[PDB]
Design a binder for these strands. Structure first.
Ligand SMILES: [Mg+2]
Lengths: 1324, 278, 34, 252, 50
DNA sequence: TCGTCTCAACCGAGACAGCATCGTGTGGTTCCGTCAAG
DNA sequence: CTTGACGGAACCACACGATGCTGTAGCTCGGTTGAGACGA
């Protein structure tokens, strides 16, 4: 029992008991980072894939025409010296070195143990490690970016149908897309005219016989082993045939096969049935007599070269004819090798593909694959062989992991799961056998929309591939540099280069699409952006490449891929999510656990089951009747065996579900009543919850799902307790806890600091902060919540707030799906939000004059100079209005060519002719708030501003203050430990002296430790950071806008009901009941029939019941009753039909008062997704708290006062706040600066541009029969020179003439057309 | 089918280049000295293997390989044009040095948009070479402080020298793979091209024209002739001493009292310093 | 895959035989360029 | 243009034109030395691929730039730009006197009027308020006019409300679906930042109040206002262009 | 559509706001809501399912 | 026995050093615009 | 209404590298085109 559960317990309604606790959410990226980095390991590291596996495949090298070797035992990880809270405010991006030890061993180039000169030394730091935090994110140059799990196609060969318009046939085979892990993309297309032709990226179509002859297999042996295995002889009655009963099954025999010494099997014109097959099986006659007319349709496998004749009488892979059989008879051929194909058997398409284009020589295939790669070049056998080896056999620019060989072995059939990483010709034999088996029709075709055909990758494999590419580039550079060098003439450190791997690890996080910016506006976005499964990026399908193939789901995703979590817009279906209980495998495969059930009893152990065995095994349903004996009471349950739902027997199943929340992801599972909603609007509500923003007062959610505390625990913004103990002092800047004597070491017992995250900037310009929820003098446990982040309160996830909500169309304010608020939300500041707005200003150095932070700026009034100091920066916490100068930036100018009007207005006012302009940045329109802090970065060895000195002195006194308070708490812990030690038998004496000396040594070690920590902080804060070149000082001011509720804000609930508020209506216009609480936010009753979600009504009914119980316990606490009445009240609450009771455990004085003070503001529920609360417990909870049972309240009309002749429904709806406000989208522009290619306005002049008046806008404009505004908006608003001037003069003077003129768009067009030399003239 | 490319066609065309003994090149250089259009043609059509071997080393640059083989044969023909056979050595090293000079000129003139002379690109090349040498032992990002300490140069000087290296990217390759919006419509010009700026210019011109027409004649004349606003040139009282007033102090006092009158009528018209210069 | 692993094992065996057959280890500095 | 820190911002057309300039200069310096046939064939082929990279990109040249992976932009990418083979004036056209906002429903307003907040009403009527301020006789300048509309004075609403009651505005959804997405209305003077709309026109918009981004348009001359109140005022386009049913459809 | 076709434009659009206003007022003073008793479940549905 | 009528792939969109002037920095006087002083 | 003094441009000579040139020699779906097929 945790300490947070004593303050808040959740009334659950799960009729099914919980058999498995919710696992770690971000463990996949955690152990992927642990496998790729290998920070904590022994001297014998793991042999799995990663940076060590990428280094061990390349680092043993041999010099061409020389003797050189490089050995390594391992690498050494670097120590992260940059603090996270100082690198988000300085810009260090978590730099961490990585040094390796290379052994340069030389030889005498004779393959013997002679001249063994080994030089074992540590090399330079190969790049910089990312060094991500424990939360699962890493900072990339100030901002925090995360990786996305690439859900590309699985490595291997698939065989689908792909019926399209290009084939123009009902039954056709698709192209075999061989997909390796990196590089060497090969294709195998099946031609419709009984042929097979491979394809390439840029080359044309090539036959499969040339590919086999280039791989190494001869055409005759491949044509023999491809079709069948049958030999023909000439013995006895002029021919001898080997009869096969398997090939003759289902074939209409048109000839006589009466051989067998007077026993006829099938007569002429009789179909071969199973009786003739059984007769041939019981006879066993291997020799049959056929006429010579049947041999004409057969095709030979190899060339028939008789040794007596001396010439080739039959070509390789050719048909037999009436003269060819006579030639083979007269040439005295003993054994004839030919293929046997039937209509009921597989069609001989491989022989027809091998017989095409006369491909029978190895040199012809070599020059064909040389012309396919480099056409029109010098045909060389060695160069083409080396190119084919580097493309197929060698690992040069080609990396394939073992999962592709595992998928190929699972496809073609093999007992060994692990295969070789290099491709061979035997895999080509398996894939040709697989494609002719697919063209025969046996087996099942693969589905490209399956979970097995879409592998979920991570950052580790792609990072290892990029590091391997950079490492083979550095190895090629070192081999090119050390070609003519020697051992004593060169150096092992100077020959290596860590620059290509540093450039590769730079582009892997800076210019890669997979390392996009992390959505940190909401903790749900923070936990779901790690678990995104996107198909885009390199080696995947983009938005236009999706079609109708990867946007659909197969029922093999039972507990693996959640389809109710994808971003709405232009990409739905190809970007997927990861489920809750789904755990990836070692091979990167998505697997889900299942409960093994026998015929009589139910087992306890759980095994993670893959997708390849679920197609053969039966999977039952966990939502079944159980009589507490381990058996199903029903005789028929909805099960699935062949990836399709059906009905089965309870003694026939073998597996069932673990939990019903294993199929849904963590985005949609936070919405209650998922089984009452449709997946469309639940997906929309999950998307708006992922795109949510925090609030000011974090009110706890009324109707909860139970996993709110779990998703608050796994979130990195919360404060997790490493060790338990009592809490000494709680502060909003930092908290400290004591360490008990059980879970502690000998020395340095009490050491626990927790720097709370102050008001800093997120990625979507929203504020983040940590609020403590504990007291002084209380004990905690391991993993306890100390301080909750934004949109989290007192240990649970608390995103928005709740208010009284009814379902009524009220005066057209909630017209279709709109919102009508009340004055309580603006008077109590409930759903208001505060954004932190960034403003990055640079102070660069130009060639005509440098810039600096100088407060003496020309054209500055009194209201601007009063805010800024003698330095040039506004003070901490000043009110910033619209159109205020914040930063100080003066740029010089020379030869400005000033007008006489400007010097006249300068000489009238008597001001000095300042030749230095003012290019200081200002706020946009609609921003009027208060700044909180400013972060300044300067270069190393440059002049520093006095505001920078004030900032660094405030930071150093804050750092010294927290160092002093942690030194104070550790010396208080040491003194209380010594005082608890000396009281035992005080009245031997050598031990006490020893312990005092050990305590003095410990406190002096802590003193010198804080001295070197302060020295490190001073040497890290006084130095300069790596900034952009040409910049003297980089400042950034953090402006916080205190935004309130305005008419037009975005408001949506939890079930996908998007709406906009209308105005600020008062508290009296809304209808009220007889109790005294008027309704606040009124919704429309169209959200329930149109959007297919009835969970609105159930959620608002449970919210009404929860507010009834909360008001009852509030008036019970007001009435000053005893604790026996409160525990009887909790007993009659927690003894419903659903869920379980956890009463009679908490103490009355502490825990009961704690749960009262922490549950007076509402109680949370705990409902599952597919076996949640039924309606009868909701009717009981409505009827026990003096509320109507159907939600049929009787309300009073506030507007007209007439009594309603109908009962209404009110309640409480927990809604969310969105990042769809008006202030970030408002563009305020009347006149904007025109562009350079045409006279169209654009941004950049401290004003946002307009919208795109493209083709559809002007099409809808000329939809009506008008012509004057079409040219007015095209020659007056844009694309003119003097037309706007004469029209403004006509507007100012008043008279209108409407002169036509000549626009500049015709001038741009005539220049762009006469750039090609085109005669254009006017007739007139 | 056949290849519709140029590099393959060039590689097939250069296959007929012979490589005889050095006495043939000695005789060709002797015949090219007196003047004949056969030895120069043979030297330009029989020595392309060294040209393509030079051009294969300068791959992955801001140019194309056709430009590299063109500067190679241009340096070769400039080497054999003014070729002196009195040394009696091989002209392959001379053609190699000429091709090195031509590829240095190609790096100088065909890489960056801003053109550079020889000395600044030479000091940029040795500075980037020194940075490449020191970054192998530094194992971090190259900063100008260590380069200035190693090269015995001031930090501001090497900062101004590295400031010339712009390395400008494209205007269509935006941030990210999905280039839904280019960088042409992002930034604007630095000059005043807004209709607000020109509108304020013409309104201020008409306003000061009305204020000069509403003032006295002598004050408007001394305000228009001195600054050159109302159809006047760039002349002053030293040039208008025989035009308006002979004494410079008298017309200077008239000018400053006219400026004070303009300031007081702007103050009475609702125009102050804070309302004009923010 | 297998050929690179066999070359790595052969190079490791040759380095072990060179280290156990009279050869020593030359410990160069971590930051040294020729 | 000079960028931040002495840098510059150039297009690829400068690079391709400079490259064909240098190749023509090398042609000029090579034609005057009695050159053989093979090198002038190679140089004319080089100029052919150079001017082919000048006019188009992505066919046979495949020229790359320095320290990047994206190909250069030819003059086809100046006459067209991005988004297929559509022109630069046809791909994007940022029109002046516009700005995107979010909409909301206003039920207390008629069909012949609407709502509009003052924060954008001070700028969408900026030449009108400049003409009225210079014609009535309170401020003949324009910089003091900008100062008094940015200082939030008390008289700016009284001098601004004359061109609010009887002045049309245009409003278009940024996802355009049909011809009813553009409309004409009459603003009033309200508080806040977002725009109130007519209730019975969102069905003609096919735009439920889901918090999208809708942009407004204000034409400059009064002739365009008269013809907009003739063509797309909501008392004129009552019938839908599909059939005989009205596009103003009553909601639930 | 019928009253639009028989009266023109101005009387239609002045009828439209008055009909919208009385519809808004009669929606405000109405009292319908979709509840848990709104979705009536017949007892023969489980018989059909079984 | 040959001209014309389909027919399936092909392609493309939504280094180093030296030589001969050279161009604005760097004052150099000089003219100009202004500041006291009667 | 007169007089004499200092700070800021204004071409211009001097000039310090600095421009400029030169020699060493080892996804679906529509317009294009080559190829088989049939009758006068
Ligand atoms: Mg919407």
């Amino acid at each position: 029992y945790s300490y947070t559960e004593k303050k808040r317990i959740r009334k659950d309604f799960s009729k099914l008991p919980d058999v498995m606790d919710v696992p770690y959410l971000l463990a996949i990226q955690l152990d992927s980072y642990r496998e790729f980095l290998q920070a904590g390991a022994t001297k014998e590291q793991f042999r799995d894939v990663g940076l060590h596996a990428a280094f061990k495949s390349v680092f043993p090298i041999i010099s061409y025409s020389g003797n050189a070797a490089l050995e390594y035992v391992g690498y050494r990880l670097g120590e992260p010296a940059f603090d996270v809270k100082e690198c988000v405010l300085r810009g260090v991006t978590f730099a961490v070195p990585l040094r390796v030890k290379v052994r340069l061993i030389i030889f005498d180039r004779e393959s013997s143990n002679k001249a063994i000169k080994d030089i074992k030394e540590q090399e330079v730091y190969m790049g910089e490690i990312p060094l991500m935090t424990e939360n699962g994110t890493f900072i990339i140059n100030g901002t925090e970016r995360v990786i996305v799990s690439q859900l590309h196609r699985s490595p291997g060969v698939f065989f689908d149908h792909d019926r399209g318009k290009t084939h123009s046939s009902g039954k056709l085979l698709y192209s075999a897309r061989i997909i390796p892990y990196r590089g060497s993309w090969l294709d195998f297309e099946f031609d419709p005219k009984d042929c097979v032709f491979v394809r390439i990226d840029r080359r044309r179509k090539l036959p499969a016989s040339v590919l086999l002859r280039a791989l190494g297999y001869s055409t005759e042996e491949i044509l023999n082993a491809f079709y069948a295995t049958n030999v023909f002889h000439i013995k006895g009655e002029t021919l001898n045939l080997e009869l096969v009963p398997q090939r003759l099954r289902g074939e209409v025999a048109s000839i006589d096969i009466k051989d067998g010494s007077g026993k006829v099997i099938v007569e002429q014109g009789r179909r071969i049935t199973a009786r003739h097959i059984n007769q041939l099986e019981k006879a066993g006659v291997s020799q049959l007599e056929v006429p010579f007319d049947y041999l004409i349709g057969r095709t030979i496998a190899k060339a028939i070269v008789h040794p007596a004749t001396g010439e080739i009488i039959a070509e390789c892979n050719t048909e037999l004819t009436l003269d060819l059989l006579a030639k083979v008879a007269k040439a005295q051929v003993v054994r004839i090798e030919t293929l046997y194909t039937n209509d009921i058997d597989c069609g001989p398409f491989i022989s027809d593909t091998l017989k095409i284009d006369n491909t029978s020589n190895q040199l012809e295939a070599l020059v064909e694959i040389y012309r396919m790669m480099r056409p029109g070049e010098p045909p060389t056998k060695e160069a083409a062989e080396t190119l084919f080896g580097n493309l197929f056999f060698s690992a040069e620019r080609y990396d394939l992991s073992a999962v592709g060989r595992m998928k190929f072995n699972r496809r073609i059939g093999r007992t060994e799961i692990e295969g070789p990483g290099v491709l061979s010709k035997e895999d080509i034999i398996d894939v040709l056998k697989t494609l002719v088996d697919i063209r025969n029709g046996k087996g099942i075709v693969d589905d490209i929309d399956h979970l097995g055909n879409r592998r979920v990758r991570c950052v580790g494999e792609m990072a290892e591939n990029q590091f391997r590419v950079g490492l083979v580039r550095v190895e090629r550079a070192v081999k090119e540099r050390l070609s003519m060098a020697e051992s004593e003439g060169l150096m092992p450190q100077d020959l290596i280069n860590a620059k290509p791997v540093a450039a590769a690890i730079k582009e892997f996080f800076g210019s890669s699409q997979l390392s996009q910016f992390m959505d940190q506006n909401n903790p749900l976005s923070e936990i779901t952006h790690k678990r995104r499964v996107s198909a885009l990026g390199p080696g995947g399908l983009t938005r236009e490449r999706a079609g109708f193939e990867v946007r659909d789901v197969h029922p093999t995703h039972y507990g693996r891929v959640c389809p109710i979590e994808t971003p709405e817009g232009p990409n739905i279906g190809l970007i997927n999510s990861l489920a809750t209980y789904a755990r990836t495998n070692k091979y990167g495969f998505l697997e889900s656990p299942y409960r093994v059930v026998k015929d009589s009893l139910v087992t306890d152990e759980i095994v993670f089951l893959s997708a390849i065995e679920e197609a053969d095994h039966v999977i039952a349903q966990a939502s079944a009747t159980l009589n507490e004996k381990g058996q199903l009471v029903d005789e028929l349950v909805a099960v699935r065996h062949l990836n399709e739902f059906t009905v089965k027997a309870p003694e026939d199943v073998t597996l069932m579900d673990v939990s019903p929340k294993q199929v849904v992801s963590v985005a949609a599972s936070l919405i209650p009543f998922l089984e009452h909603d449709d997946a469309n609007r639940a997906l929309m509500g999950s998307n708006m919850q992922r795109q949510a923003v925090p609030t000011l007062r974090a009110d706890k959610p009324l109707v909860g799902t139970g996993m709110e505390r779990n998703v608050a625990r796994d979130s990195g913004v919360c404060v997790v307790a490493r060790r338990g103990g009592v809490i000494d002092s709680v502060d909003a800047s930092r908290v400290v806890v004591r360490v008990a004597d059980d879970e502690v070491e000998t020395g340095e017992a009490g050491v626990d600091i927790y720097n709370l995250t102050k008001y800093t900037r997120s990625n979507q310009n929203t504020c983040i902060n940590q609020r403590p929820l504990v007291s002084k003098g209380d004990v905690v446990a391991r993993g306890d919540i100390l301080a909750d982040g934004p949109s989290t309160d007192m240990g649970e996830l608390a995103l928005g707030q709740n208010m009284r909500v009814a379902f009524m169309p009220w005066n057209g304010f909630n017209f279709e799906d709109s919102i009508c608020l009340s004055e309580r939300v603006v008077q109590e500041d409930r759903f208001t939000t505060i954004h932190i707005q960034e403003l990055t200003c640079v102070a660069r150095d130009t060639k005509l004059g440098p810039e600096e932070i100088t407060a003496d700026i020309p054209n500055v009034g009194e209201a601007a100079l009063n805010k800024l100091d003698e330095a040039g920066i506004v003070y901490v916490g000043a009110e910033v209005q619209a159109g205020d100068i914040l930063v100080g930036k003066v740029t010089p100018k020379g030869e400005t060519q000033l007008t006489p009007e400007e010097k006249l207005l300068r000489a009238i006012f008597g001001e000095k002719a300042s030749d230095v302009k003012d290019t200081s940045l200002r706020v946009p329109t609609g921003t009027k708030g208060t700044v909180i802090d400013v972060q300044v970065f300067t270069r190393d060895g440059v002049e520093r501003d006095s505001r920078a000195l004030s900032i660094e002195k405030m930071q150093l006194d804050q750092i010294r203050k927290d160092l002093n308070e942690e030194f104070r708490i550790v010396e208080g812990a040491t003194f209380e430990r010594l005082r608890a030690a000396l009281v035992g038998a005080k009245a031997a004496d050598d031990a006490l002296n020893e312990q005092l000396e050990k305590a003095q040594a410990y406190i002096s070690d802590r003193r010198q430790l804080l001295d070197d920590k302060f020295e490190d902080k001073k040497r890290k804060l006084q130095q300069g950071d790596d900034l952009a070149p040409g910049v003297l000082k980089i400042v950034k001011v953090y402006l916080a806008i205190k935004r309130r509720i305005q008419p037009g804000d975005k408001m949506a609930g939890r079930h996908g009901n998007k709406g906009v508020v209308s105005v600020i209506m008062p508290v009296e216009d809304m209808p009220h009941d007889a109790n005294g609480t008027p309704v606040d936010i009124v919704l429309n009753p169209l959200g329930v029939p149109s959007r297919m979600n009835v969970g609105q009504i159930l959620e608002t009914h449970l919210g009404l019941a929860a507010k009834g119980l909360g008001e009852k316990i509030n008036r019970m606490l007001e009435e000053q009753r005893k604790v026996a009445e409160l525990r009887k009240f909790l007993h009659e609450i927690y003894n419903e039909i659903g869920g379980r009771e956890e009463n009679l455990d908490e103490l009355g004085d502490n825990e009961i008062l704690a749960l009262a003070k922490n549950l007076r503001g509402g109680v949370p529920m705990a409902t599952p997704v597919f076996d949640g609360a039924k309606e009868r417990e909701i009717k009981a909870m409505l009827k026990l708290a003096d509320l109507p049972e159907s939600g049929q309240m009787r309300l009073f009309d506030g507007r007209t006062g007439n009594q309603f002749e109908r009962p209404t429904t009110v309640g409480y709806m927990y809604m969310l706040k969105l990042n769809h406000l008006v202030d970030d989208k408002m563009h305020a522009r009347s006149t904007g600066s025109y562009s350079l290619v045409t006279q169209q306005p654009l941004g950049g002049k401290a004003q946002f541009g307009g919208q795109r008046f493209g083709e559809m806008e002007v099409w809808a404009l000329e939809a009506y029969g008008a012509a004057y505004t079409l040219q007015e908006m095209l020659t007056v608003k844009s694309d003119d020179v003097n037309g706007r001037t004469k029209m403004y003069k006509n507007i100012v003077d008043g008279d209108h003439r409407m002169e036509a003129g000549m626009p500049e768009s015709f001038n741009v067009l005539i220049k762009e057309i006469r750039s090609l030399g085109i005669d254009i003239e006017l007739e007139t | 089918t056949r290849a519709l490319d140029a590099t393959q066609l060039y590689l097939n065309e250069i296959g007929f280049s012979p490589l005889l003994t050095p006495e043939e090149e000695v005789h060709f250089a002797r015949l090219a000295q007196k003047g004949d259009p056969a030895g120069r043609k043979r030297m330009i059509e029989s020595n392309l293997r060294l040209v393509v071997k030079i051009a294969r080393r300068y791959v992955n640059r801001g140019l194309s390989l056709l430009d590299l083989i063109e500067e190679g044969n241009l340096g070769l023909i400039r080497a054999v044009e003014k070729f002196d056979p009195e040394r009696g050595f091989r002209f392959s090293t001379y053609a190699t040095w000429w091709i090195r000079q031509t590829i240095e000129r190609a790096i100088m003139n065909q890489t960056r948009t801003i053109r550079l002379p020889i000395h600044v690109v030479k000091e940029l090349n040795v500075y980037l070479r020194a940075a490449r040498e020191l970054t192998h032992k530094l194992d971090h990002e190259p900063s100008p402080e260590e380069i200035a300490n190693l090269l015995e140069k001031p930090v501001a000087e090497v900062k101004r020298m590295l400031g010339l290296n712009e390395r400008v990217t494209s205007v269509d390759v935006s941030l990210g793979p999905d280039s839904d919006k280019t960088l042409l419509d992002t930034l604007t010009d630095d000059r005043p091209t807004d209709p607000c700026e020109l509108l304020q210019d013409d309104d201020l011109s008409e306003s000061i024209d009305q204020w000069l027409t509403e003032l006295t004649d002598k004050q408007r004349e001394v305000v228009i002739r001195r600054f050159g606003l109302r159809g006047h040139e760039s002349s002053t009282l030293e040039e208008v001493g025989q035009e308006i007033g002979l004494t410079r102090e008298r017309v200077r006092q008239i000018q400053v009292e006219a400026l004070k009158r303009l300031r007081e009528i702007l103050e009475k018209n609702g125009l102050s310093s804070d309302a004009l210069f923010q | 895959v297998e050929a690179k692993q066999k070359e790595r094992d052969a190079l490791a065996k040759a380095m072990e035989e060179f280290l156990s057959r009279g050869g020593k280890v030359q410990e160069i500095e971590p930051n040294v360029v020729a | 243009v000079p960028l931040d820190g002495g840098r510059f911002a150039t297009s690829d057309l400068n690079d391709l034109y400079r490259r064909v300039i240098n190749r023509n200069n090398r042609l000029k310096r090579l034609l005057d030395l009695a050159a053989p046939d093979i090198i002038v064939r190679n140089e004319k082929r080089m100029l052919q691929e150079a001017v082919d990279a000048l006019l188009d990109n992505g066919r046979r040249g495949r020229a790359i730039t320095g320290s990047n992976k994206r190909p250069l932009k030819s003059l086809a990418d100046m006459i067209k730009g991005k988004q297929g083979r559509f022109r630069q004036n046809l791909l994007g056209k940022r029109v002046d006197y516009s700005g995107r906002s979010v909409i909301t429903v206003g039920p207390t307003l008629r069909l012949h009027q609407c709502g509009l907040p003052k924060k954008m009403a001070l700028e969408l009527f900026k030449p009108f308020i400049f003409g009225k301020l210079e014609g009535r006789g309170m401020a003949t300048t324009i910089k003091a006019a900008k100062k008094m509309v940015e200082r939030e004075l008390p008289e700016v609403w009284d001098v601004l409300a004359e061109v609010i009651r009887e002045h049309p505005v245009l409003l278009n959804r940024a996802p355009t679906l049909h011809r009813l997405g553009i409309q004409a209305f009459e603003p009033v003077l309200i508080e806040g930042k977002a725009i109130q709309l007519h209730p019975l026109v969102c069905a003609a918009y096919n735009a439920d109040f889901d918090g999208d981004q809708m942009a407004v348009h204000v034409p400059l001359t009064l002739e365009a206002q008269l013809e907009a109140r003739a063509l797309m005022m909501s008392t004129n386009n009552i019938l839908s262009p599909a059939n005989g049913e009205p596009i103003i459809v009553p909601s639930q | 559509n019928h009253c639009y076709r028989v009266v023109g434009l101005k009387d239609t659009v002045i009828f439209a706001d008055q009909l919208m206003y009385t519809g808004f007022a009669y929606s405000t003073i109405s009292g319908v809501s979709i509840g848990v008793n709104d979705f009536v479940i017949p007892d023969e549905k489980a018989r059909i399912i079984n």
